[PDB]
Structure 1
């Protein structure tokens, strides 16, 4: 499913991402926009052989298992296909683990290069939530 900005902001809030680990909602929404264009089915293959899955583009080398990434650690103990679902629960739940990593949202290159230090509040403005 392809989410709307406000549609996604509310689903993330409801799933407990607003200010999770100190990152306000606009950060999570900004990240998803640049990571998957709000599309839950997005996948992107990496040079090292791993693939990124879903709305938050979670990587198959550490977080999920896609059965084709040797040295996969599957930290969120879930098959990667579970992250492509129209229900963002598994992505949100695994994302909470990644952000708790000790590296924050820097784990998402699109967040680091395009969201970090911008008025991220602009991403939820006008949304009911």
Structure 2
């Protein structure tokens, strides 16, 4: 599913990401825009051989099992394919674990490079939330 911006914002809000560990909702919307272009089916390889999955491009190196990332962990206890669903629940629940872990949203390279330090409230401008 390719979410609309406000559609995604509303789903993320319902799932409690607004100001989760201090990250206002626009952070999460921004991150998804640049990680996945709002596409739940997005998959991308990394140079280490891991793959990033879904709307928030959760990585098989640590967070999910895809059976093809040697030495990796599955800290969200989920098949990576579960993260490609039109329902964002599994991705959000995993994201909450990731962001709570010490490094905050820096885990998301696109967030760090494109959202951090910017007016992220612009990403929820016009949305009824």
**What's 1:126 paired with?**
126
Q: Runs of 5+ in structure 1 lacking a partner?
A: none
Cα offset, 1:78, TM superposition: 0.1
Cα offset, 1:74, TM superposition: 0.2
| Pairing of 1:57-76 with structure 2 (within 5 A) | 57-76=57-76
Cα offset, 1:47, TM superposition: 1.4
SS across alignment from 1:44? strand
Q: How many residues align?
A: 129
- 1:66, 1:41 → 2: CA distance? 15
Cα offset, 1:72, TM superposition: 1.5
Deviation readout 1:52-86 (Å, 9 max, x if unpaired): 00000000010000011111210000000000000
**What's 1:115 paired with?**
115
Cα RMSD between the aligned structures?
Answer: 0.5
| Pairing of 1:6-85 with structure 2 (within 5 A) | 6-85=6-85
Cα offset, 1:46, TM superposition: 1.2
Q: With the length of structure 1 as denominator, give the TM-score of the two structures.
A: 0.99
Q: With the length of structure 2 as denominator, give the TM-score of the two structures.
A: 0.99
SS across alignment from 1:91? helix
